[PDB]
Amino acid sequence: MSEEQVAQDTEEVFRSYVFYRHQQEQEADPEMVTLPLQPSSTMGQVGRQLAIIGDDINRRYDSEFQTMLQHLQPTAENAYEYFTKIATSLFESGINWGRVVALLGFGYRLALHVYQHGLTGFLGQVTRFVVDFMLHHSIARWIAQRGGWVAALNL
Amino acid sequence: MSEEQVAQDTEEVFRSYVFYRHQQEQEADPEMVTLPLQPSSTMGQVGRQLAIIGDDINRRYDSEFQTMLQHLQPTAENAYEYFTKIATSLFESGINWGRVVALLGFGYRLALHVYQHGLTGFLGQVTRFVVDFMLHHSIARWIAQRGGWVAALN
């Protein structure tokens, strides 16, 4: 399992996470409902799963989080910087499966806050910041050492 | 901070820990109380500060923990088989500094139990078991990334 096979499943893992969790939340974002997924996508269960097991936790911190990033008011220019920068400090203290999931949740928190703010189509770029931060900080290696994203279906 | 740099530095980060942790665990084994310390390395400070922050948490589970090491009964050959096996699980969940001091604490506890069961001069292997495992299981590349062992001084 190369840390690069983790790199491309993540383009499928994130998109799934954003989508399947968008619909549970509606109980919006065009780009997240347009959002299509390849068929026989085994990694689509992963983004469906990870959005589920972490929902009742993620239905608590939604308050103070809608006001924090707006003061950041990301753009098209400093969005990657703030991404990689917020994410470096989330793993300077310790890795685990929640912190990697808690990492994806914030891309959604960013890819959605960015849409409500008038940055159409930025959904493609948020997927890269994930992949790109993950390959370049030894987060994808952590996943290929443990097997891959399929083994996250044991939570 | 280089990977095996942190590796070579792991040589006396451990030798310090065991030295200071035994000086306080008594509050015995002359293989560690006499464990010669280098002069003038910050790696010695790292082994002392972690020796005395975990000591309290390393003071309750000492009854339950070593009771297992008998029923396990590890020798001088499967020692590395057993060491790696438990430490691979100690990290299979998630990495952090708290568990990095938990591996060294197992390194203090395996050293102590082998003397107490007739295995002499094996502190010179429970050191190496601790340095090889980390450079070959992504732990030294975890430490070098955050500045190294000196970063633990917080």
Binding site: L69, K85 | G94
Partner: peptide
């Protein structure tokens, strides 16, 4: 840098709450 930190430091908590539902 304070928006950045408190945002990250927020993410650790849900990362260890969601970690327990995981492990």
């Amino acid at each position: 840098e304070e928006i950045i930190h408190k945002l990250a430091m927020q993410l650790r908590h849900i990362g260890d709450n969601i970690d327990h539902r995981m492990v």
